[PDB]
């Protein structure tokens, strides 16, 4: 399609790059939620 099947590769790359960035931010949120579990303990 060239619009398209390969232009949606960049388009959906935004999904994978947002999920990779968000996997870093979610690792930073997980390791920080251990804080709240501990401080609530």
């Amino acid at each position: 399609l060239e619009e398209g099947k390969a232009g949606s590769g960049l388009r959906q790359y935004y999904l994978s790059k947002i999920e990779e960035l968000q996997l870093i931010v979610n690792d930073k949120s997980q390791n920080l939620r251990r804080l709240q579990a501990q401080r609530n303990e």
Binding site: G9, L10, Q12, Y13, S16, N31
Partner: protein, 480 residues
């Protein structure tokens, strides 16, 4: 004949045990790791893959020859076959060949027989899911095969292996592209393979066009998908570009980025070595001394072997040009000592204030410096030897005569006695005030400013580094 005849059977089954289950458990484990998790990557069997490649690269590689286990090259590249439920029967066929080799003699087919063999993953039609498993099953015989170095007619099969790998690379670029995860396991392989590209090309011809291909790959990683790949591609670039003039110096500034995150561990530090020599060509040592020192402290634990010693060979060069150098035998290694003996006499005569002592070492030991290409320092180091001598004589004498100082440093004439000091004052080497009548040179010792400025500048590095230790400890502490 009876003794050797009975010693032939035992060896071949030792690999046929381990090497059979090695990439079956590692490749077959990464097969289920590639279907899901796939986080990150990880794919911890990729790190295990580094360990396995390095495992065969000591013992037993692939072959040889040996007329026994040379049939493993067609074995693992056959029978995908084809879809996963059909692969069970093929996994059993791999074991049927064990009874074939146990009953009759083992068949050896290599060299010209490898052309249809490498095309059998394309003949099976197909794997069809994992390009990296086919790239690993095709490369794993090919990668230690370079250790043959026969150079006749099987190097064009290495070119055919780069062509078959480029077919697998077209399949690497076209397929997936959305949460690829095959690329991140393949970037380790595109790394190693491209280093084997340059390895094979060093024995025949440097690669001008393969750098066009390499730079296509390089720039095409950003921004679409780059994980660990481009950090290696930049080092591929730098590796032969440092050996081949020119301009490659300022090429790094337009490439960076950085490129973060630094990977893989020590693999980034060696990059700092390459650019350390580069940035040394600009004569800036303060930027060069840190990049050199970081290379050594960032690289554990060896062995092997001599490149970790060579990076230290060039480590102390920039410090020798600085004028402040520690004694280098604290890093002395029994395998390294024997290699830098001439070099060690060099630094020995460099720290001294005798100029003739320094000019003798270049004459006798220059033949070794030709091979290292290290003559770039030998022209600019003289400035540092004269500056060292004048520094000594400055602090060690209250009042010195300019005519009488020339005999000790073999300065040879009265006129340059004024010149060394002129630029010494211009660069802030000595605070002494000089009177030209006869003339004479007097010097004075000033202090008390001293610990005002110098320790606070160090503290700025000390404390920032200590809080960085605190941040790096908190980061790894919060994971549980």
């Amino acid at each position: 004949p009876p003794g050797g005849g009975e010693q032939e059977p035992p060896p071949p089954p030792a690999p046929q045990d381990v090497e059979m289950k090695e990439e079956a458990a590692t490749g077959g484990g990464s097969t289920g790791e590639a279907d899901g998790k796939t986080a990150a990557a990880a794919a911890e069997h990729s790190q295990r893959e580094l360990d396995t490649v390095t495992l065969e690269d000591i013992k037993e590689h692939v072959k040889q020859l040996e007329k026994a286990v040379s049939g493993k090259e067609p074995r693992f590249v056959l029978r995908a076959l084809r879809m996963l439920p059909s692969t069970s029967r093929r996994l059993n066929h791999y074991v049927l060949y064990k009874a074939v080799q146990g009953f009759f003699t083992s068949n050896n087919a290599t060299r010209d027989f490898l052309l249809p063999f490498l095309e059998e993953p394309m003949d099976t039609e197909a794997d069809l899911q994992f390009r990296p498993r086919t790239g690993k099953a095709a490369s794993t015989p090919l990668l230690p095969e370079v250790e043959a170095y026969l150079q006749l007619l099987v190097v064009i099969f290495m070119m055919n292996s780069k062509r078959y790998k480029e077919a697998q690379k077209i399949s690497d670029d076209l397929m997936q592209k959305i949460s690829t995860q095959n690329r991140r396991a393949l970037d380790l392989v595109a790394a190693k393979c491209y280093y084997y590209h340059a390895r094979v090309y060093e024995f025949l011809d440097k690669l001008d066009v393969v750098r066009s291909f390499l730079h296509a790959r390089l720039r095409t990683a950003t921004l679409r998908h780059d994980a660990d790949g481009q950090a290696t591609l930049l080092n591929l670039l730098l590796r032969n570009y440092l050996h081949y003039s020119l301009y490659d110096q300022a090429e790094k500034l337009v490439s960076k980025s950085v490129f973060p995150e630094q990977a893989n561990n020590n693999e980034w530090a060696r990059y700092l070595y390459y650019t350390g020599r580069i940035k040394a060509i600009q004569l800036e040592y303060s930027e060069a001394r840190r990049t050199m020192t970081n290379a050594l402290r960032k690289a554990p634990q060896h062995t092997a072997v001599g490149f970790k010693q060579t990076v230290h060979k060039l480590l102390i060069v920039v410090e020798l040009l600085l004028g402040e150098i520690p004694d280098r035998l604290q890093f002395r290694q029994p395998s390294l000592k024997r290699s830098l003996m001439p070099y060690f006499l060099l630094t020995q005569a460099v720290r001294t204030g005798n100029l003739a002592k320094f000019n003798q070492v270049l004459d006798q030991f220059g033949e070794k410096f030709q091979a290292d290409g290290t003559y770039t320092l030998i022209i600019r180091l003289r400035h540092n030897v004269i500056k060292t001598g004048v520094r000594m004589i400055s602090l060690s004498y209250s009042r010195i005569s300019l005519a009488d100082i020339a005999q000790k440093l073999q300065l040879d004439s009265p006129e340059d006695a004024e010149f060394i000091v002129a630029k010494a004052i211009r660069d802030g080497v000595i605070e002494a005030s000089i009177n030209h009548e006869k003339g004479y040179v007097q010097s004075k010792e000033m202090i008390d400013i001293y610990s005002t400025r110098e320790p606070q500048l160090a503290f700025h590095q000390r404390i920032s580094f200590c809080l960085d230790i605190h941040n790096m400890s908190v980061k790894a502490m919060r994971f549980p």
